[PDB]
């Protein structure tokens, strides 16, 4: 990449790298998911068992991938032959009751839409217009960047992605704008928070159960087969993440209580 | 010696914090160091992690199964042998003797069969040991004379899941849930712990930036 801006952000990542914490992720032995809601996963490093907040780790991971593949991303083609399945930006912003007028939703879509040439070129965030060019209510999301092979992010957080792209990104400053978009992509990419559902409660429906069980399975499989192997292979741990990694048990201490028959 | 207090407080915590039903609602996180099962327990608003020894917990189950179901093999005596007690009502009420290889014929007791093994000798001192072991007792149907008990403890140890054996969710789940069937299954038959509380997950304000506006 020809850019002066991306290099400053890559240097900023390099300055925050924690050598010892990076070694912990480089040599992790994946144990499993502890909490799908709070997003806690357990890993083994040498003689220790760690409780990790994978919301925080995926955030930096996807941010780092975004930084590395900037202007050279593959695409997740979001459109099918089913036109009714299209992702309309106006429809997404309707999740926000504070955007109580068509104009306030149109304000957000206008900025995003005028920046569509670069959003597509640099980020692989492709926006299309189905009707007349000035119809913001018919502005659509056709592609998203493909950050990790085998990974397709959940689109449940698309409303937040559009709302924050339209309100949080500082479009006026080249560096802050670029950083801001990569941050938004990273935020959308983090696996969802799966709230806990009581499987013993006869009060809750039969269909709501196997659906929680499917979400619980999808994340365990995602973390185990896609995410943790990527984390283990390329993750650079910033020092601000030490609060997100916590030692919970150590083999020397466990082996003083648990003994052979 | 003074280090054993840390062991005691662990078993003390378990007797209060974990009920028979608590085990049926435990969820497997995964396998740790090819020797442990990490489990979560969220009930009611309380959330805790427990660490389970895959061998000792599997063994406590197999052992208690052997203690309850197994009919021990006996040697049909050539000429029946009598015995004097008082205690006579304990023998003339329990088919715990038949399970321990003692077939009887009901002051006036008649021993028809004595238990047998290719690795140990059985006598009347074992029959009287079982007679006195019921005096202690709780459920009495699973009571076994020390010789038999020891042999079942070895059978369980040899047949149970080994440490270093990789396990899948299905197996780990069965191992933990099986503990709900036993009474206070905190130790294996050799006195080693089956499980221990790791940590309570009370207040962890995890990353949430992705849902913040
Ligand atoms: Zn044992
Ligand atoms: Zn054993």
Kindly list the characteristics that best describe this protein.
heterodimer, A: about 260 residues, alpha+beta, four-stranded antiparallel sheet, three-stranded antiparallel sheet, 10 helices, 7 strands, about 50% helix, B: about 210 residues, two-stranded antiparallel sheet, elongated, binds zinc ion, DNA mismatch repair protein MLH1 (chain A)
Shape of chain A: globular
Task: Write down the Rg of chain B.
Answer: 22 Å
Largest interface: A-B, 39 and 42 residues
Broad shape of chain B? elongated
Return the domain count of chain B. Answer: 1
Tally the beta strands of chain B: 6
Bound ligand species: zinc ion
**Order of helical and strand elements of chain B:** HHEEEHEHHEHHHE
Radius of gyration of chain A: 21 Å
* Tally of contiguous helical segments of chain A: 10
PDB class: hydrolase
Keywords: mutl, endonuclease, Zn-binding protein, DNA damage, DNA repair, hydrolase
Assembly: dimeric
Entry title: Structure of the C-terminal domain of the Saccharomyces cerevisiae MUTL alpha (MLH1/PMS1) heterodimer
Report on the structure:
The complex is a heterodimer of chains A (261) and B (213). Chain A has helices spanning 4-16, 19-26, 54-69, 89-93, 102-114, 116-123, 158-167, 174-189, 206-234, 251-257, and strands spanning 29-35, 40-45, 48-53, 74-77, 126-129, 139-146, 245-250. In chain A, a hairpin with a 4-residue loop joins strand 1 (29-35) and strand 2 (40-45). The termini of chain A are far apart. Chain A has 261 residues and is of the alpha+beta class. Chain A is built from 10 helices and 7 strands. Chain B is α+β, with helices and mostly antiparallel strands and 213 residues long. Chain B has a 4-stranded antiparallel beta sheet. In chain B, strands 4-5 form a two-stranded antiparallel sheet. The chains are: A alpha+beta (261), B alpha+beta (213). Chain A binds chain B through residues 30-35, 38-40, 42, 44, 49, 53, 55-56, 59, 96, 157, 160, 163-164, 167, 187-188, 190, 193, 196, 200, 244, 248-249, 251, 254, 256-261, and chain B through 3, 6-7, 10, 25, 28-33, 35-36, 38, 40, 42, 47, 49, 51, 53, 55-56, 59, 157, 163, 188-190, 192-193, 196, 198-199, 201, 204, 206-211, 213. The complex binds zinc ion (2 copies). Residues 56, 59, 157, 188-190, 192 of chain B line the site of one zinc ion.
């Amino acid at each position: 990449v020809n850019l002066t801006s991306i290099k400053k952000l890559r240097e900023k990542v390099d300055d925050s790298i924690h050598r010892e914490l990076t070694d912990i992720f480089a040599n992790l032995n994946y144990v499993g998911v502890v909490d799908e809601e709070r997003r806690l996963a357990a890993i083994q490093h040498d003689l220790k068992l760690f409780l990790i907040d994978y919301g925080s780790v995926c955030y930096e991971l996807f941010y780092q991938i975004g930084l590395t593949d900037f202007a050279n991303f593959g695409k997740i083609n979001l459109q099918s032959t089913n036109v009714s399945d299209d992702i309309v930006l106006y429809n997404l912003l309707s999740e926000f009751d504070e955007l109580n007028d068509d104009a306030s939703k149109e304000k957000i879509i206008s900025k995003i839409w005028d920046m569509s040439s670069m959003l597509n070129e640099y980020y692989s965030i492709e926006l299309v217009n189905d009707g007349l060019d000035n119809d913001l209510k018919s502005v659509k999301l056709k592609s998203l960047p493909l950050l990790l092979k085998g990974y397709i992010p959940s689109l449940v957080k698309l409303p937040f992605f559009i709302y924050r792209l339209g309100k949080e990104v500082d479009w006026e400053d080249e560096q802050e704008c670029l950083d801001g978009i990569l941050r938004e992509i990273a935020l959308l990419y983090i696996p969802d928070m799966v709230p806990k559902v009581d499987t013993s409660d006869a009060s809750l429906s039969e269909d709501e159960k196997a659906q929680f069980i499917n979400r619980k399975e999808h994340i365990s499989s995602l973390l185990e087969h896609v995410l943790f192997p990527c984390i283990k292979r390329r993750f650079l741990a910033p020092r601000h993440i030490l609060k997100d990694v916590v030692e919970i048990a150590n083999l020397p201490d466990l082996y003083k209580v648990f003994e052979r028959c | 010696k003074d280090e054993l207090e840390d062991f005691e407080q662990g078993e003390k915590y378990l007797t209060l914090t974990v009920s028979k039903n608590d085990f049926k609602k435990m969820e497997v996180v995964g396998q740790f160091n090819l020797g442990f099962i990490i489990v979560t327990r969220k009930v009611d608003n309380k959330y805790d992690l427990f660490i389970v020894d895959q061998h000792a917990s599997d063994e406590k189950y197999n052992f208690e199964t052997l203690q309850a179901v197994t009919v021990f093999k006996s040697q049909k005596l050539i000429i029946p042998q009598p015995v004097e007690l008082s205690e006579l009502v304990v023998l003339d009420n329990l088919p715990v003797f038949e399970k321990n290889g003692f077939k009887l014929k009901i002051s006036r007791v008649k021993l028809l069969s004595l238990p047998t093994s290719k690795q140990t000798l059985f006598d009347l001192g074992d029959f009287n040991e079982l007679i006195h072991l019921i005096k202690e007792d709780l459920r009495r149907d699973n009571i076994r004379c020390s010789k038999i008990r020891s042999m079942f403890a070895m059978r369980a140890c040899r047949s149970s899941i080994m440490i270093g054996k990789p396990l899948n969710k299905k197996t780990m789940t069965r191992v933990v849930h099986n503990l709900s069937e036993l009474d206070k299954p905190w130790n294996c038959p050799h006195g080693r712990p089956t499980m221990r509380h790791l940590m309570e997950l009370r207040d962890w304000s995890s990353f949430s930036k992705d849902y913040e506006i």
